[PDB]
Each structure stands twice: as C-alpha cells, then as structure tokens.
Amino acid sequence: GPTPMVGLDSVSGQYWDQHAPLAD
C-alpha cells in the first residue's frame, strides 16, 4: 500500500499496508 516501508501490500504490490500514522 501507500506508506514508505516494504511488504504486506500483495493486493497492489506496493510499500506497506498496516494502519497507524506512518503505515496508513
């Protein structure tokens, strides 16, 4: 998903996915 990290986001192939104000 949209956050500046890596992994999890296997529904769009992107850079993290896990809600909290760096991960939203």
From Swiss-Prot:
Compartments where found: Cytoplasm; Secreted
Effect of residue 14 to A: Decrease in cleavage by the isopeptidase AtxE2
Superkingdom in the source lineage: Bacteria
Effect of residue 11 to A: Decrease in cleavage by the isopeptidase AtxE2
Cross-link Isoaspartyl glycine isopeptide (Gly-Asp): where in chain: 1-9
PTM annotation: This lasso peptide is hydrolyzed to a linear form by the isopeptidase AtxE2, in vitro. The isopeptidase AtxE2 only recognizes the threaded form (but not the unthreaded form).
Signal peptide span: none
Domain notes: Is composed of a ring composed by 9 residues, a 5 residue-loop (SVSGQ) and a C-terminal tail. The peptide is threaded when the C-terminal tail is inserted throught the isopeptide-bonded ring. The loop region serves as a recognition element for the isopeptidase AtxE2.
Entry function: Shows weak antimicrobial activity against its phylogenetic relative Caulobacter crescentus. Does not show activity against other bacteria tested (E.coli, Vibrio sp, Burkhoderia thailandensis, and Salmonella newport).
Record's protein name: Astexin-3
Organism this protein belongs to: Asticcacaulis excentricus (strain ATCC 15261 / DSM 4724 / KCTC 12464 / NCIMB 9791 / VKM B-1370 / CB 48)
